[PDB]
């Protein structure tokens, strides 16, 4: 055929309901509870209107269709060519239309009301009205298909364009997909894994009536954060298999720069063909992806950021046993007889006698300037109610003499960061770690998945996942980080995705104080390198961060010292607050580092950001400004979604004095900048093979 859909707009009311659980399928159900009427400790509700179902005309009114949805306007899947047809009946008060975004039209579709020389009956369905039900038309074009390089199905949607703003916010949108020819072939017989998330910011407090003067109608107040239209862990549906994977259909939406990020307390995501686990999502995007679902149980698919949590956005996703249908110093380096080149494949486990102790740190040592300099000084130079310059925090060290070895020492060309740590695929990590600070903290890696404290997969008597608890009081614990491939680089991605680790004594706070480090991840087996003694090769790391001492467990121990008056100082006001918020940029501020990059020094920068939230522009501006390659080569650019990351090849054929781009409002002349060098001389190698060691 060429299938025809019939859409409505029944003005119904929303729940954001509770219960969740399941419902008991096929022959005999019972949605949970049913304790009668009175105050179910009440569940606020607003009234909206969303596109709908129906086989012809009918009345209807109630709750949601296929559990995992209801809200989400009716999904429209389609093959290529076989044209689709609609017919919306505005059974609502809003005159709303229907757009399309991503296909063929004829002006007989782009629901708009602008100067488009065409006149009515061209602008007819380009905007309907109450009670009036008007028909729609558009085709699936060859110029609209996949790209033989694109997954078989493009995440697309639609909605009523008669003013997005006072529309969307009520429920104007559904799912629209297009995919390779005869496709009703294998979807109509196998993949019940046709699920489509819908991260939205319904501002239901902009779409229906006004007032403001702090008893029959329906509305209350402000913002939201949801998914498919649910919140606080709620939202039924969502179930995947074991050995098999799933396919995600996302759709941004928020009618305002308000962004929203999202991980999966359980996985790594696959877009394009790059591991990214984070669904870096914008105010309105159509990002598809998937997930090789190993393991089992339920994971908190949720929005990871700032104040988007308690406001919802969190939604569980379960998995289960699926059916089965089969038919002064320096002088050492030994030597004997060279075996030509020497193969010897497979992996090996890395060692790390590392720990985390206290110490005061400063973002100096550069110029000063009192009174006047009310910027580059509210920090580095302390006052009667200012301390800046140096604070007492705690980082990660490789330690040179504990009771269990060492192998450290370090240059400042990599700030407070944690002694970097490679990770070949398959390879495994042993991180003999021990406290050595005041308050017990932890150390977990954010990029891996198999993290069981070797010798046994058990856990501190009572507990669940080392993160949330296993604090260590001044104790010492042995860790094992094993590395599958799931944990690392595809093909389409440059091998070596940046990463990081830190405490989870809570799941965040400690950090700010100072605990942090990088943790690469890569793969290869052709022809490697190295060095010897105190000489590395992949020490190109950088990470900007928002360190708010106003939250470090050492604000008092810091103050009572560096601060004149004992504790007479003020409580907390926008005043000194922001005057104690130094910005790292690798923990250094304004200037330091300047790095040691040479001429033609083919570089390989591993970079990321942390601290506070907000996307970030960042670049190289020097004796060449500089470009790099995130596949394609790119300008003054680098947009990492905070608490997120990506590295980058930076073949360095430039020069010196590199304003290291933070390129963002206050951040610029508040603290960041930085520089880069341009050396010369010193090098070796060997003719045709390997030898220098």
């Amino acid at each position: 055929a060429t299938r025809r859909y019939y859409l409505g707009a029944v003005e119904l009311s929303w729940d954001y309901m509770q219960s969740d659980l399941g419902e008991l399928p096929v022959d005999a159900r019972f949605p949970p509870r049913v304790p009668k009427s009175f105050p179910f400790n009440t569940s606020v509700v607003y009234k909206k209107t969303l596109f709908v179902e129906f086989t012809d005309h009918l009345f209807n009114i109630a709750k949601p269709r296929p559990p995992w949805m209801g809200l989400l306007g009716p999904t429209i899947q389609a093959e290529v060519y076989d044209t689709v047809v609609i017919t919306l009946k505005n059974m609502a008060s809003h005159p709303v239309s229907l757009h399309a975004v991503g296909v063929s039209y004829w002006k007989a579709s782009e629901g708009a009301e602008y100067d488009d020389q065409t006149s009515q009956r061209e602008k007819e369905d380009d905007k309907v009205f109450p009670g009036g039900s008007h028909t729609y038309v558009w085709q699936v074009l060859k110029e609209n298909g996949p790209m033989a390089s694109d997954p078989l199905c493009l995440t697309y949607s639609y909605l009523s364009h008669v003013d997005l703003v006072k529309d969307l916010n009520s429920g104007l949108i559904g799912a629209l997909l297009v995919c390779r020819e005869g496709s009703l072939a294998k979807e109509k017989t196998q993949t019940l894994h046709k699920f489509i998330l819908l991260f939205a910011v319904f501002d239901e407090g902009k779409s229906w009536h006004s007032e403001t003067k702090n008893a029959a109608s329906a509305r209350a107040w402000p913002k939201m954060h949801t998914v498919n239209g649910y919140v606080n862990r709620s939202l039924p549906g969502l179930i995947g298999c074991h050995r098999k994977s799933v396919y995600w259909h996302v759709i941004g939406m928020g009618t305002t720069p308000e962004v929203h990020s999202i991980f999966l307390e359980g996985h790594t995501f696959l877009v394009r063909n790059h591991r990214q686990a984070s669904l870096e999502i914008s105010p309105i995007t159509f990002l598809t992806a998937q997930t090789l679902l190993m393991d089992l149980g339920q994971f908190l698919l949720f929005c990871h950021i700032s104040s988007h949590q308690h406001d919802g956005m969190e939604a569980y996703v379960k998995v289960d046993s699926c059916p089965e249908e089969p038919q002064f110093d320096d002088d050492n380096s030994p030597s004997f007889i060279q075996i030509r080149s020497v193969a010897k494949k497979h992996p090996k486990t890395w060692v790390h006698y590392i720990a985390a102790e206290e110490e005061d740190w400063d973002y100096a040592p550069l110029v000063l300037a009192p009174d006047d300099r009310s910027y580059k000084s509210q920090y580095l130079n302390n006052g009667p109610q200012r301390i800046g310059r140096k604070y007492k925090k705690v980082r990660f060290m490789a330690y040179t003499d504990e009771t269990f070895k060492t192998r450290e020492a370090i240059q400042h060309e990599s700030g407070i960061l944690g002694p970097l740590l490679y990770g070949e695929v398959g390879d495994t990590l042993l991180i003999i770690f021990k406290n050595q600070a005041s308050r017990p903290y932890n150390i977990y890696p954010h990029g891996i998945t198999d993290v069981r404290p070797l010798y046994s997969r058990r856990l501190p008597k009572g507990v669940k996942h080392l993160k949330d608890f296993p604090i260590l009081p001044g104790e010492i614990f042995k860790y094992k980080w094993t590395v599958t491939v799931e944990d690392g680089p595809t093909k389409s991605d440059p091998r070596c995705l940046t990463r990081y680790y830190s405490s989870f004594v809570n799941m965040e706070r400690d950090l700010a104080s100072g605990l942090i480090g990088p943790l690469l991840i890569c793969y290869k087996e052709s022809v490697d390198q190295r060095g010897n003694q105190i000489m590395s090769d992949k020490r190109n790391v950088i990470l900007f961060s928002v360190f708010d001492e106003n939250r470090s467990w050492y604000l008092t121990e810091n103050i009572q010292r560096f601060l004149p008056n004992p504790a007479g100082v003020q409580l907390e006001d926008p005043e000194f607050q922001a005057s104690n918020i130094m910005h790292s940029i690798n923990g250094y501020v304004f200037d330091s580092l300047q790095l040691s990059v040479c001429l033609h020094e083919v570089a390989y920068w591993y970079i990321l950001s942390i601290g506070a939230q907000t996307d970030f522009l960042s670049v190289f501006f020097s004796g060449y400004t500089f470009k790099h390659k995130m596949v394609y080569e790119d300008t003054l650019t680098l947009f990492p979604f905070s608490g997120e990351t990506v590295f980058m090849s930076m073949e360095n054929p430039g020069l010196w004095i590199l304003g290291c781009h933070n390129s963002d409002f206050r951040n610029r002349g508040m603290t960041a900048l930085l520089k880069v060098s341009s050396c010369d001389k010193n090098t070796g190698d060997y003719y045709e093979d390997s030898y220098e060691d």
Binding site: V101, E110, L164, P257, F286, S622, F626, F639
Partner: protein, 644 residues
């Protein structure tokens, strides 16, 4: 000693200007009390190019660069060669040119950035690098890159008051060797963003027009906050963006170098239009969330014409400007405007002189002794036309006339256009020049069929004889295709419509005569060529089983002229149907609309149709005949959805 091996120089500077929008204001005092009137103006600064003589000559441009927004000039450049960017200041704050590729900068105990910083105004300077590959298009197509330029003095303060540059590139044998860049397809750069002002130029700027409007709390915070916020691409809040002359069916490529503050993450959309992109493959999309500072180019294509739009789907920043229509056309029509055939009435015209009865009421083959064309004299003459409305023009034709012995023509003219007279454009075109110098004829019956394409638009077209033979003069019938690319023949004449699809009532047949509708098409001739009913009644009807539905922009009529007694059709009506069983008369302004046409037969005449009918079947009935009721004809339309 004289050959060549690649290099490109570009003259450019940073001048200040005035900035606004709008095209609908209020009279001197049409409301004696107080209402509107104002016109928010601004003192921004952008990049301009020329030759060297600063102002006067020849800081100039225009034409396919209409859409250039504030944006500097398209500083293109293939690969491997060298960018020669000579720059001159031209305003306050010593701004500075810059691009991530200002690479290959000597070095030697100096500072390629700590020194080349800013350039005090007045004083000028140049920058000149090599086109290294570590900065350019790849094996994975999208033939031209999209780099960017702007001052690195304060870095932002600058950027805001305008001053922005789109430096693209391409690879080797790719750009029209000499005078031109690419063209294999069309290139457009749309710079999305959010202008805030204040955090911009300074003093005077933020000081033009002062006081306090309706419902104010204070200033410097609760004042007209989002008022000084421009939400626009190339700075054209509201569907104000200019230069978007499309080209139905010509691969296209957009350079969407966004940038801005930290809110400017505008997820762009192209009103009903998909496309492709690359980053190591043919990844396809229909939206693109340009992040402030990004750049990415994209390759789409218009399958159909009409007017569409583009806008940050971010409800707010959209419902606040940022959006434009890109008028695309159908190169397949270039239909004649009819300056030979009646239609365009003598009414529409004018020049500056009749110079002897020779005048605007004459043009294109009109033959009559020696009063068959327009003419002029020595003065810097000029002729204008008013299509009665705006339309697209694929091009014009031109001729001449001889007076007794000596002959008259023209040899080169310049064209000017606009949409209200008030405005006036001295049309450039492809080839270089501060204007496009065309070419005339050189005798009567020249016919220099020129052809804008870059096609033009407007309602008014002027022609200015730059050179002529003894006496300027001419005829013509310039042709176009109009707004939403329509108005072109449909079968009938082209015989592209089965004479089995044209049924009708009375069809008098004879022993010589045989006026079966099968022979009822414009200009047609032959044996019993035209249509004649059994007998001339005041009703009758001719049918056209159009088959597939259609959009009709109008109809043309005629009438044979047989054996010493020709005959036309003056008054008449038209029907419409969705099969041969239901009809809907075409009423107008009120009841029926008596269509007036034909005053002879040796010519064709046509009726408009304020409200374009559109059906798969069309009937027609005449009223005020002449001698008899003959009719030959054809319609007017442009395809549109069917099988429904």
């Amino acid at each position: 000693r004289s050959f060549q091996k690649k290099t490109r120089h570009y003259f450019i500077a940073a001048v200040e200007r005035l900035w606004d929008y709008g095209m609908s204001s209020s009279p001197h005092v049409l409301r004696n009390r107080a209402q509107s009137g104002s016109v928010p103006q601004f003192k921004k600064v952008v990049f301009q190019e020329f030759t060297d003589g600063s102002f006067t000559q020849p800081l100039y441009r225009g034409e396919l660069n209409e859409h250039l927004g504030l944006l500097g000039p398209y500083i293109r450049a293939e690969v491997e060669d060298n960018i020669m960017v000579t720059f001159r200041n031209q305003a306050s704050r010593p701004y500075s040119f810059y691009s991530s590729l200002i690479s290959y900068e000597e070095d030697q105990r100096q500072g390629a950035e700590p020194r080349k910083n800013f350039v005090k105004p007045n004083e000028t300077k140049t920058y000149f690098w090599k086109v290294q590959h570590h900065m350019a298009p790849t094996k994975d197509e999208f033939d031209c890159k999209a780099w960017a330029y702007s001052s690195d003095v304060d870095l932002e303060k600058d950027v805001h008051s305008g001053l922005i540059g789109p430096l693209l590139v391409c690879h080797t044998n790719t750009l029209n060797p000499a005078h031109g860049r690419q063209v294999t397809v069309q290139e457009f750069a749309l710079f999305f963003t959010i202008f805030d002002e204040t955090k911009s130029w300074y003093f005077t700027e933020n000081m033009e027009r002062n006081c306090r409007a309706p419902c104010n709390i204070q200033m410097e915070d609760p004042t007209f906050k989002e008022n000084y916020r421009f939400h626009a691409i190339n700075g054209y809040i509201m569907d104000t963006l200019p230069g978007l002359v499309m080209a139905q069916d010509q691969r296209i490529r957009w350079y969407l170098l966004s940038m801005g503050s930290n809110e400017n993450i505008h997820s762009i959309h192209f009103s009903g239009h998909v496309f492709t992109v690359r980053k190591k493959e043919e990844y396809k999309m229909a939206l693109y969330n340009l992040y402030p500072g990004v750049f990415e180019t994209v390759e789409m294509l218009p399958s159909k014409a009409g007017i569409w739009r583009v806008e940050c789907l971010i409800g707010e920043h959209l419902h606040a400007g940022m959006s434009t229509l890109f008028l695309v056309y159908s190169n397949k029509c270039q239909t004649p405007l009819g300056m030979a055939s009646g239609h365009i009435r003598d009414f529409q015209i004018t020049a500056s002189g009749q110079y002897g009865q020779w005048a605007p009421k004459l043009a294109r083959l009109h033959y009559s002794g020696s009063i068959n064309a327009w003419s002029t004299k020595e003065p810097f003459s000029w002729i204008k036309v008013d299509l009665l409305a705006p339309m697209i023009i694929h091009g014009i034709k031109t001729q001449g006339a001889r007076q007794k012995f000596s002959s008259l023509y023209i040899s080169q003219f310049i064209i000017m256009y606009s949409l209200d007279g008030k405005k006036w454009q001295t049309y450039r075109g492809n080839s270089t020049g501060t204007l496009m110098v065309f070419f005339g004829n050189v005798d009567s019956s020249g016919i220099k069929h020129n052809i804008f394409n870059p096609p033009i638009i407007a309602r008014y077209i002027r022609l200015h004889p730059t050179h002529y033979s003894i006496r300027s003069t001419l005829r013509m019938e310039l042709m176009g295709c109009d707004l939403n690319s329509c108005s072109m023949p449909l079968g009938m004449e082209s015989k592209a419509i089965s004479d089995a699809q044209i049924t009708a009532s009375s069809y008098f047949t004879n022993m010589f005569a045989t006026w079966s509708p099968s022979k009822a098409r414009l200009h047609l001739q032959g044996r019993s060529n035209a249509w004649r009913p059994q007998v001339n009644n005041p009703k009758e009807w001719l049918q056209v089983d159009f088959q597939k539905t259609m959009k009709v922009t109008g109809v043309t009529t005629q009438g044979v002229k047989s054996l010493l007694t020709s005959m036309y059709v003056k008054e008449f009506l038209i029907s419409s149907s969705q099969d041969g069983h239901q009809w809907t008369l075409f009423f107008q302004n009120g009841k029926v609309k008596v269509f007036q046409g034909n005053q002879d037969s040796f010519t064709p005449v046509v009726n408009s149709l304020d409200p374009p009918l559109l059906t798969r079947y069309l009937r027609i009935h005449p009223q005020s005949w002449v001698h008899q009721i003959a009719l030959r004809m054809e319609v007017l339309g442009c395809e549109a959805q069917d099988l429904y």
